[PDB]
């Protein structure tokens, strides 16, 4: 499939992608430190999917070493875009050369390309290189702009609609299910969610029943199990609670439900009760499980109703998608293509606006104001896996046994850690040189100022001063957009297809009072079948992967091409092996398995 024409020897790559090839013609330029060359017209043909095309370009005058190559498509009819994967060099002094693009080339400009080697700002001083860093970041600043969407959401990509977004971002039952049909009326499944669901990550240890939940020992007797009050039981650290005030005020109708959970015998976390609104009275009754039958049960429907809105919005759309795309757009605006930390996470923001964008224009009320509170609540802080389990008090293992989500997220966060600090360490010398990184420190003060709305609060760093504090502003980057995204987006239909355990809309206003509430007003609270239909739909739609699925760790487009970093992906690869290992035995002694955060069903980026 190589097609060779017959001094320089320039290999052209073209892309696989079904319009990856073109039929205009294709000029190329090299430019060395002794002066450029003329520019050669490849001969005759058109560059096809998966094509290798070499050529033999003869040069009047010695070139010295190459400094860059320029590509010019000039036109044979209706202009038809081509995808470059990488430009090779065999120099007459015997030297190989490889220059990397993954760039679609419409024609409308030329593209230079800089060597594979990763260079700092600070690596370039003869002036060739220089305009050309500067004259890529003053092209990515107007191509790649911000704009905020709603008010106070994170700014996103200055793009109505998806052909709006430059051309190189452009895109291109089961058997967790079934036990949820046959056990989503379990206290055990339910409270079960709550950790290795779909939405893991709201549930927190409860060091004082909140004064909004008068609940008494004697409502919840039948519940414990310790022989304790609930009083002491909160002390020994067996009380858990689920609060949705972030729902409160939001505008057929929504909740705010408490929900109290209890560490049993077993060491499972089942509820034992349930306020669905905010404030206590007469008219918002603490369920309880040993309340009538479908009391209880709808009790348990509205908390599942309410975990799915933040779930989708807040912990699915806002906390990955809008995050990554907000990271995304930085690397692009600050980051040139031959600098080190764009090779590495270029990777992990593939598709990510392109994706985001195609949900805004088809997307398009109570759910904007949702994300403008959310807003408050999004902290730096918060997106560092550790710390984030910690804040909720469930770091414990022994305490907090059957907790998955934590388990496995934990590893593949430390070998993202272990990753991106390796990879720091192979292009930072030392502190002072990340300090100093002019274009790191660009993309750390759009990403403060323009993502997050440059919010004090937000904890978020307003510039980055060493290696350590470098490789965690990476492995967040990364970390979000693969793994966490990949445990919160592929359970969907796991947990969702079922409706009454993720009701998407609900029907009716919450039972304000016991003894009233019967199957009938159940099941006509619960959301139409035109509704289910679209819902099911949309939910298996998005926990499908795509078969060109890229997973972590799988880089086939070398942007990198040192050894020293390839290495440093070698050992992360073995590594991610490892822990899809671990991971298999865990699952094999277990009820019904946690496999979401595995790393061989983790992608790279938030691409669906
Ligand atoms: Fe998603």
Same mark, same amino acid.
């Given at each position: &499939?190589?097609?060779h024409?017959?001094?320089?020897?320039? !290999?052209?790559?073209?892309?696989?992608?079904?319009?990856?090839?073109?039929?205009?013609?294709?000029?190329?330029?090299?430019?060395?430190?002794?002066?450029?060359?003329?520019?050669?017209?490849?001969?005759?043909?058109?560059?096809?999917?998966?094509?290798?095309? &070499?050529?033999?370009?003869?040069?009047?005058?010695?070139?010295?070493?190459?400094?860059?190559?320029?590509?010019?498509?000039?036109?044979?009819?209706?202009?038809?875009?081509?995808?470059?994967?990488?430009? !090779?060099?065999?120099?007459?002094?015997?030297?190989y050369?490889?220059?990397?693009?993954?760039?679609?080339?419409?024609?409308?400009?030329?593209?230079?390309? %800089?060597?594979?080697?990763?260079?700092?700002?600070?690596?370039?001083?003869?002036?060739i290189?220089?305009?050309?860093?500067?004259?890529?970041l003053?092209?990515?600043?107007?191509q790649?702009?911000?704009?905020?969407?709603?008010?106070?959401?994170?700014?996103?990509?200055?793009?109505?609609?998806?052909?709006?977004?430059?051309?190189?971002?452009?895109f291109?039952?089961?058997?967790?299910?079934?036990?949820?049909?046959?056990?989503?009326?379990?206290?055990?499944?339910?409270?079960?969610?709550?950790?290795?669901?779909?939405?893991?990550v709201?549930?927190?240890?409860c060091?004082?029943?909140?004064?909004?939940?008068?609940?008494?020992?004697?409502?919840?007797?039948?519940?414990?199990?310790?022989?304790?009050?609930?009083?002491?039981?909160? @002390?020994?650290?067996?009380?858990?609670?689920v609060?949705?005030?972030?729902?409160?005020?939001?505008?057929?109708?929504?909740?705010?439900?408490?929900?109290?959970?209890?560490?049993?015998?077993?060491?499972?976390?089942?509820?034992?009760?349930?306020?669905?609104?905010?404030?206590?009275?007469?008219?918002n009754?603490?369920?309880?499980? &040993?309340?009538?039958?479908?009391?209880?049960?709808?009790?348990?429907?509205? /908390?599942?109703?309410?975990?799915?809105? /933040?779930? @989708?919005?807040?912990?699915?759309?806002?906390?990955?998608?809008?995050?990554?795309?907000?990271?995304?757009?930085?690397?692009?605006?600050?980051?040139?293509?031959?600098?080190?930390?764009?090779?590495?996470?270029?990777?992990?923001?593939?598709?990510?606006?392109?994706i985001?964008?195609?949900?805004?224009?088809?997307?398009?009320?109570?759910?904007?104001?949702?994300?403008? %509170?959310?807003?408050?609540?999004?902290?730096?802080?918060?997106?560092?896996?550790?710390?984030?389990?910690?804040?909720?008090?469930?770091?414990?293992?022994?305490?907090?046994?059957?907790?998955?989500?934590?388990?496995?997220?934990?590893?593949?966060?430390?070998?993202?850690?272990?990753?991106?600090?390796?990879?720091?360490?192979?292009?930072?010398?030392?502190?002072?040189?990340?300090?100093?990184?002019?274009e790191?420190?660009?993309?750390?003060?759009?990403?403060?100022?323009?993502?997050?709305?440059?919010?004090?609060?937000?904890?978020?760093?307003?510039? /980055?001063?060493?290696?350590?504090?470098?490789?965690?502003?990476?492995?967040?980057?990364?970390?979000?957009?693969?793994?966490?995204?990949?445990?919160?987006?592929?359970?969907?239909?796991?947990?969702?297809?079922?409706?009454?355990?993720?009701?998407?809309?609900?029907?009716?206003?919450?039972?304000t009072?016991?003894?009233?509430?019967?199957?009938?007003?159940? /099941?006509?609270?619960?959301?139409?079948?035109?509704?289910?239909?679209?819902?099911?739909?949309?939910?298996?739609?998005?926990?499908?992967? @795509?078969?060109?699925?890229?997973?972590?760790?799988?880089?086939?487009?070398?942007?990198?091409?040192?050894?020293?970093?390839?290495?440093?992906?070698?050992?992360?690869?073995?590594?991610?092996?490892?822990?899809?290992?671990?991971?298999?035995?865990?699952?094999?002694?277990?009820?019904?398995?946690?496999?979401?955060?595995?790393?061989?069903?983790?992608?790279?980026?938030?691409?669906?």
């Open positions: &499939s190589s097609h024409h017959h001094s320089y020897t320039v !290999t052209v790559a073209t892309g696989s992608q079904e319009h990856a090839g073109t039929d205009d013609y294709i000029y190329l330029s090299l430019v060395g430190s002794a002066g450029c060359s003329e520019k050669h017209l490849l001969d005759k043909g058109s560059f096809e999917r998966g094509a290798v095309d &070499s050529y033999d370009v003869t040069v009047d005058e010695e070139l010295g070493e190459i400094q860059l190559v320029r590509i010019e498509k000039r036109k044979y009819g209706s202009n038809d875009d081509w995808y470059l994967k990488y430009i !090779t060099l065999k120099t007459p002094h015997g030297d050369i490889e220059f990397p693009c993954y760039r679609w080339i419409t024609g409308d400009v030329e593209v230079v390309l %800089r060597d594979g080697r990763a260079k700092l700002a600070r690596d370039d001083q003869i002036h290189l220089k305009q050309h860093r500067r004259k890529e003053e092209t990515r600043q107007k790649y702009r911000w704009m905020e969407w709603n008010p106070g959401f994170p700014l996103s990509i200055d793009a109505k609609c998806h052909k709006d977004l430059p051309r190189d971002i452009q291109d039952s089961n058997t967790i299910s079934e036990r949820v049909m046959n056990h989503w009326q379990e206290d055990l499944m339910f409270g079960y969610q709550f950790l290795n669901g779909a939405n893991p709201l549930i927190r240890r060091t004082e029943l909140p004064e909004k939940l008068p609940v008494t020992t004697e409502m919840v007797e039948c519940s414990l199990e310790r022989q304790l009050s609930l009083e002491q039981e909160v @002390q020994q650290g067996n009380i858990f609670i609060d949705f005030e972030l729902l409160d005020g939001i505008d057929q109708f929504l909740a705010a439900p408490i929900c109290l959970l209890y560490k049993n015998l077993a060491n499972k976390i089942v509820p034992i009760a349930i306020q669905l609104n905010q404030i206590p009275g007469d008219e009754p603490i369920f309880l499980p &040993s309340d009538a039958k479908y009391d209880w049960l709808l009790a348990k429907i509205w /908390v599942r109703s309410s975990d799915f809105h /933040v779930h @989708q919005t807040i912990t699915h759309l806002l906390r990955t998608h809008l995050v990554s795309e907000v990271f995304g757009i930085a690397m692009y605006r600050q980051l040139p293509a031959v600098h080190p930390i764009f090779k590495l996470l270029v990777a992990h923001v593939r598709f990510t606006i392109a985001n964008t195609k949900a805004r224009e088809q997307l398009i009320g109570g759910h904007v104001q949702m994300v403008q %509170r959310a807003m408050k609540d999004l902290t730096y802080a918060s997106l560092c896996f550790p710390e984030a389990i910690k804040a909720r008090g469930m770091e414990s293992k022994e305490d907090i046994p059957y907790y998955f989500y934590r388990d496995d997220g934990l590893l593949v966060w430390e070998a993202i850690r272990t990753f991106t600090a390796e990879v720091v360490d192979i292009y930072y010398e030392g502190d002072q040189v990340v300090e100093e990184d002019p790191l420190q660009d993309f750390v003060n759009d990403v403060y100022v323009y993502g997050m709305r440059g919010r004090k609060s937000s904890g978020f760093p307003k510039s /980055v001063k060493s290696r350590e504090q470098l490789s965690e502003y990476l492995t967040v980057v990364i970390f979000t957009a693969s793994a966490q995204h990949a445990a919160v987006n592929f359970g969907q239909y796991d947990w969702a297809s079922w409706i009454p355990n993720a009701p998407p809309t609900m029907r009716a206003p919450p039972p009072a016991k003894g009233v509430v019967t199957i009938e007003q159940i /099941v006509d609270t619960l959301p139409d079948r035109g509704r289910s239909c679209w819902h099911l739909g949309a939910v298996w739609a998005l926990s499908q992967f @795509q078969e060109n699925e890229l997973f972590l760790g799988m880089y086939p487009e070398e942007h990198f091409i040192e050894k020293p970093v390839k290495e440093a992906m070698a050992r992360f690869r073995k590594n991610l092996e490892a822990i899809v290992s671990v991971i298999a035995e865990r699952n094999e002694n277990l009820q019904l398995p946690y496999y979401y955060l595995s790393p061989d069903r983790i992608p790279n980026s938030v691409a669906i």
